[PDB]
Amino acid sequence: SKVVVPAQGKKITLQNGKLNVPENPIIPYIEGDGIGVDVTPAMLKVVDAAVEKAYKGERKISWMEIYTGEKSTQVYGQDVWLPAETLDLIREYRVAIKGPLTTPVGGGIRELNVALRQELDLYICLRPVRYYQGTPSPVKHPELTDMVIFRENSEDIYAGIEWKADSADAEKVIKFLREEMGVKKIRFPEHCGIGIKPCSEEGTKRLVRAAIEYAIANDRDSVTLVHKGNIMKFTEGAFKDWGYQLAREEFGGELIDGGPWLKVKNPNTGKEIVIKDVIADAFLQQILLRPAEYDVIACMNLNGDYISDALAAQVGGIGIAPGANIGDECALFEATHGTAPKYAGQDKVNPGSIILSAEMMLRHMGWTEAADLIVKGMEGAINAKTVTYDFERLMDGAKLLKCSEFGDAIIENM
Amino acid sequence: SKVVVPAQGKKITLQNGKLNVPENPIIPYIEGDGIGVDVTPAMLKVVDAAVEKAYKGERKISWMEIYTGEKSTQVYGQDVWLPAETLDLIREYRVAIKGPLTTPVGGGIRELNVALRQELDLYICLRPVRYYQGTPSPVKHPELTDMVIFRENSEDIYAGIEWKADSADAEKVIKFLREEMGVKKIRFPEHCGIGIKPCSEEGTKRLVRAAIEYAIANDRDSVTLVHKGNIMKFTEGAFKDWGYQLAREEFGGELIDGGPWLKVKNPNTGKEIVIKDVIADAFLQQILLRPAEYDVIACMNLNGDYISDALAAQVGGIGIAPGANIGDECALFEATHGTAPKYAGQDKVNPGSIILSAEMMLRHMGWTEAADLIVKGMEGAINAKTVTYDFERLMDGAKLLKCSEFGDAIIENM
Numbered sequence: 001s002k003v004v005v006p007a008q009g010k011k012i013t014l015q016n017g018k019l020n021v022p023e024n025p026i027i028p029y030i031e032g033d034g035i036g037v038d039v040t041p042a043m044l045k046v047v048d049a050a051v052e053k054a055y056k057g058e059r060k061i062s063w064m065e066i067y068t069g070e071k072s073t074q075v076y077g078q079d080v081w082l083p084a085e086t087l088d089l090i091r092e093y094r095v096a097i098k099g100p101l102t103t104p105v106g107g108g109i110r111e112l113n114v115a116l117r118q119e120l121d122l123y124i125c126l127r128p129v130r131y132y133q134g135t136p137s138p139v140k141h142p143e144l145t146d147m148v149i150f151r152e153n154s155e156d157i158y159a160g161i162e163w164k165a166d167s168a169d170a171e172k173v174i175k176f177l178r179e180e181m182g183v184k185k186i187r188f189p190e191h192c193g194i195g196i197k198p199c200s201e202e203g204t205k206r207l208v209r210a211a212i213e214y215a216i217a218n219d220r221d222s223v224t225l226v227h228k229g230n231i232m233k234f235t236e237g238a239f240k241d242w243g244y245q246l247a248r249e250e251f252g253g254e255l256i257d258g259g260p261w262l263k264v265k266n267p268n269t270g271k272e273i274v275i276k277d278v279i280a281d282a283f284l285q286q287i288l289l290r291p292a293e294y295d296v297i298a299c300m301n302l303n304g305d306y307i308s309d310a311l312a313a314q315v316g317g318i319g320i321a322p323g324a325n326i327g328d329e330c331a332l333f334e335a336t337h338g339t340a341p342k343y344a345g346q347d348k349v350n351p352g353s354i355i356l357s358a359e360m361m362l363r364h365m366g367w368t369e370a371a372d373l374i375v376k377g378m379e380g381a382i383n384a385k386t387v388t389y390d391f392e393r394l395m396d397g398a399k400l401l402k403c404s405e406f407g408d409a410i411i412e413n414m
Numbered sequence: 415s416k417v418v419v420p421a422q423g424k425k426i427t428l429q430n431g432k433l434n435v436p437e438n439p440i441i442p443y444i445e446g447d448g449i450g451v452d453v454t455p456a457m458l459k460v461v462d463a464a465v466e467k468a469y470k471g472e473r474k475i476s477w478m479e480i481y482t483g484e485k486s487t488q489v490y491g492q493d494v495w496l497p498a499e500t501l502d503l504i505r506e507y508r509v510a511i512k513g514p515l516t517t518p519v520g521g522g523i524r525e526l527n528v529a530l531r532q533e534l535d536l537y538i539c540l541r542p543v544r545y546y547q548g549t550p551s552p553v554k555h556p557e558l559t560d561m562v563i564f565r566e567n568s569e570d571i572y573a574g575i576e577w578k579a580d581s582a583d584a585e586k587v588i589k590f591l592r593e594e595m596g597v598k599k600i601r602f603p604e605h606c607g608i609g610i611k612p613c614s615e616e617g618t619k620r621l622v623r624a625a626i627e628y629a630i631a632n633d634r635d636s637v638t639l640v641h642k643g644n645i646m647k648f649t650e651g652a653f654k655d656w657g658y659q660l661a662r663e664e665f666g667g668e669l670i671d672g673g674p675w676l677k678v679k680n681p682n683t684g685k686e687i688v689i690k691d692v693i694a695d696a697f698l699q700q701i702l703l704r705p706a707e708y709d710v711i712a713c714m715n716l717n718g719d720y721i722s723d724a725l726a727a728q729v730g731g732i733g734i735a736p737g738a739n740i741g742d743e744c745a746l747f748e749a750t751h752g753t754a755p756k757y758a759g760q761d762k763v764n765p766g767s768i769i770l771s772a773e774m775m776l777r778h779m780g781w782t783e784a785a786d787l788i789v790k791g792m793e794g795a796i797n798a799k800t801v802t803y804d805f806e807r808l809m810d811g812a813k814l815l816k817c818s819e820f821g822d823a824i825i826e827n828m
């Protein structure tokens with residue numbers, strides 16, 4: 001192993017489903033491909049500053065670099081794109097953060113980001129989207145956007161079950177469907193690629209459960225199940241039916257009017273939480289035309305991937321869109337954006353995304369004060385109109401800052 | 415049959431792939447469920463007016479009502495949701511228009527809208543989205559949005575191949591995948607619904623071919639292949655690879671830089687058309703942050719469904735979003751919106767969508783003058799700020815008009 005365990009740090013433990021965070025926790029991190037080389041260093045500095053200022057030296061993170069992707073090949077050798085120790089370490093230290101990752105073409109290499117999520121069973125993809133005062137947005141009222149996406153992270157089409165057109169496997173599968181299952185619906189069975197889409201009751205319910213619990217835990221107004229159930233009855237439709245069923249069976253969901261919407265009483269604030277659903281295509285117009293009407297979103301893997309980007313663009317873009325992959329044993333924080341090789345190495349991209357993901361990590365560890373300083377700094381720097389390229393557009397009088405520069409601006413406004 | 419063939423009309427014929435439209439063409443039409451009862455009458459009046467004014471009485475449409483959905487059951491009896499004659503008539507008269515349709519819950523009834531498209535093999539779902547001066551939009555520069563969506567209409571997950579969780583079929587399919595195909599990727603094989611996603615070379619290429627030909631025919635700047643190929647390699651990825659391949663093999667697509675983008679020279683205007691591609695999630699941010707950079711869009715069934723609504727909301731909403739289902743033998747025009755039973759029968763919804771779909775129909779028949787009068791009227795009425803509920807929002811000084819009222823406003827501005 002080429003990983004070096006920090007000497008002055010201590011491992012975080014999980015006792016009774018509750019995190020036990022030391023004052024010197026060891027936090028593993030993956031630099032990331034492309035721009036990850038730009039944003040990650042900015043994140044480490046901003047986090048260290050937030051922690052240093054919040055607890056005046058009482059607390060401190062012991063960063064431990066781990067590898068995945070290109071750098072892993074440089075470190076562990078050719079073909080070692082995702083070392084087993086990397087998965088071992090994330091699960092063992094409970095909390096980790098990663099920069100963007102890119103999977104090479106071919107080589108029989110599976111998508112590295114999806115591999116991490118699925119190998120660690122981090123079934124929740126949590127992506128909160130809200131507006132930051134001063135952020136240049138293409139819409140008229142970005143302030144109306146304040147939602148939290150709970151995207152199922154372990155099934156759907158992301159299962160990776162598919163076969164190439166004209167391949168022996170594809171023909172074998174197509175032969176079984178037409179001959180044994182009597183399927184006559186394939187328009188062109190020749191030179192036809194095939195993909196499988198699974199959706200289970202347990203996969204659906206553990207995701208929705210987390211979404212409702214988060215709504216209750218943070219006193220949100222509603223949980224909206226987004227699906228395309230009118231066309232995919234047994235997968236997307238099942239997801240919606242299972243979600244409503246869980247709200248009734250586990251949260252005392254009560255019929256609103258003649259339904260289908262339910263109301264769940266917040267055990268804490270006594271507030272009634274609305275449980276509704278919207279068809280995916282229609283939802284894409286709704287978030288733009290009636291944003292204020294939506295809060296927490298529970299949806300399947302693919303739909304969540306699309307909604308994440310559509311919402312982010314509403315409040316400034318993917319440069320300010322954080323996220324987290326959460327499971328029962330550990331959590332891996334990461335920004336919604338990619339490696340943008342186009343800008344890679346230029347120290348020009350917006351580090352806000354990975355930084356706000358670190359803010360989620362801090363909150364997750366219970367270091368809410370350090371988390372609050374990051375939000376304060378971010379809001380201060382953006383308001384000071386000292387921002388990165390992606391914000392400069394739709395920004396008159398804004399001063400352009402380099403990636404590392406913006407990080408410093410955040411610390412300056414803490 | 416309860417259908418009455420117009421006495422003074424004549425059937426449109428297709429000779430050499432070219433439509434032969436008489437001056438008194440018989441045009442079949444489906445009223446539609448819900449609000450279809452409101453918008454359809456407005457459309458017939460507006461179209462009749464546009465035609466009457468453009469050709470001063472020389473030309474006239476002979477409307478012939480045909481049935482599908484609820485009204486079909488009223489006419490032909492219980493269980494007759496989609497009469498065979500309806501499909502026969504659309505194919506025979508070549509050009510038809512329909513209001514929104516809703517499929518009942520259960521009854522073993524398949525989605526009626528998809529049934530029409532697939533039974534008639536109308537593989538192209540053409541949905542143009544552009545801004546109309548004076549239209550209240552949630553974005554800052556709706557005028558930058560001017561795109562044309564070419565959505566594959568015959569395959570993808572819309573094939574309707576799926577099995578219910580815990581069903582014998584589902585278990586049989588899951589057993590085959592795990593046992594015979596050795597699939598170990600299903601996270602939860604129990605209580606698991608299964609759906610099949612097919613994508614063929616012929617289905618992909620006939621759609622992309624139509625998109626490029628439209629770009630050439632209308633001198634558009636580019637064709638963008640939208641896909642989620644990084645995750646669905648053999649379906650969405652195949653679609654993108656097949657699209658690029660066709661541009662090269664059939665349109666002399668030439669490498670731009672080191673690729674992957676291609677350039678196709680417009681045989682007519684000598685202009686070079688750009689053939690590029692964008693990942694679906696990223697594309698949803700791109701249309702909002704860099705609209706001007708996109709023109710004609712070629713995408714798969716599901717992706718097209720989502721993009722249609724996301725784009726429409728950008729220029730006023732689904733109340734002003736037309737569309738057409740085009741095949742090799744016939745075409746069925748229809749708005750992107752649904753039956754909105756919530757507002758149904760209230761004569762309050764925006765008829766602009768089905769009316770602009772009729773404008774597409776007229777253009778399709780070569781009656782471009784009548785089509786131009788509809789655009790003129792629409793632009794005039796909206797500019798006069800005499801609009802329907804959906805526009806009134808984000809409209810100060812706008813006067814609210816009833817559905818039928820707005821139709822009259824259009825005719826008044828022709």
Ligand SMILES: NC(=O)c1ccc[n+]([C@@H]2O[C@H](COP(=O)([O-])OP(=O)(O)OC[C@H]3O[C@@H](n4cnc5c(N)ncnc54)[C@H](OP(=O)(O)O)[C@@H]3O)[C@@H](O)[C@H]2O)c1
Pocket residue numbers: 035039099100101102103113317318319334335336337338339340341342349350351353390644693696703704
């Ligand atoms: N979880 C992940 O690690 C992850 C996520 C997404 C994609 N990927 C991968 O990364 C590679 C490139 O993919 P892509 O180009 O489709 O996606 P991407 O890297 O997110 O790039 C898409 C566009 O979004 C914007 N963007 C991304 N990061 C930004 C930042 N830090 N600050 C400001 N704007 C930012 C830019 O838009 P403008 O150019 O309009 O400014 C950018 O060109 C692929 O190999 C892909 O699989 C990985």
Ligand SMILES: NC(=O)c1ccc[n+]([C@@H]2O[C@H](COP(=O)([O-])OP(=O)(O)OC[C@H]3O[C@@H](n4cnc5c(N)ncnc54)[C@H](OP(=O)(O)O)[C@@H]3O)[C@@H](O)[C@H]2O)c1
Pocket residue numbers: 230279282289290449453513514515516517527731732733748749750751752753754755756763764765767804
């Ligand atoms: N091709 C079709 O015939 C078609 C298309 C889509 C859906 N459907 C079906 O119709 C039913 C209802 O579905 P849905 O509620 O998901 O979709 P929908 O009927 O399109 O309604 C969605 C929302 O979009 C807006 N809208 C729709 N038509 C409008 C119009 N003419 N003018 C102004 N705004 C309009 C309204 O938004 P606000 O309430 O925010 O104003 C409406 O409540 C279902 O049975 C569904 O399967 C059929």
Ligand SMILES: CC(C)[C@H](C(=O)O)[C@@H](O)C(=O)O
Pocket residue numbers: 111113114305308336644645695
């Ligand atoms: C890179 C890709 C596999 C990934 C996904 O589709 O989830 C990305 O788009 C993201 O949102 O993290």
Ligand SMILES: CC(C)[C@H](C(=O)O)[C@@H](O)C(=O)O
Pocket residue numbers: 230231281525527528719722750
């Ligand atoms: C009603 C539904 C089957 C249809 C589709 O998904 O294409 C609708 O959303 C539309 O866009 O016409």
Ligand SMILES: [Mg+2]
Pocket residue numbers: 305306308309336695696
């Ligand atoms: Mg994404």
Ligand SMILES: [Mg+2]
Pocket residue numbers: 281282719720722723750
């Ligand atoms: Mg739709």
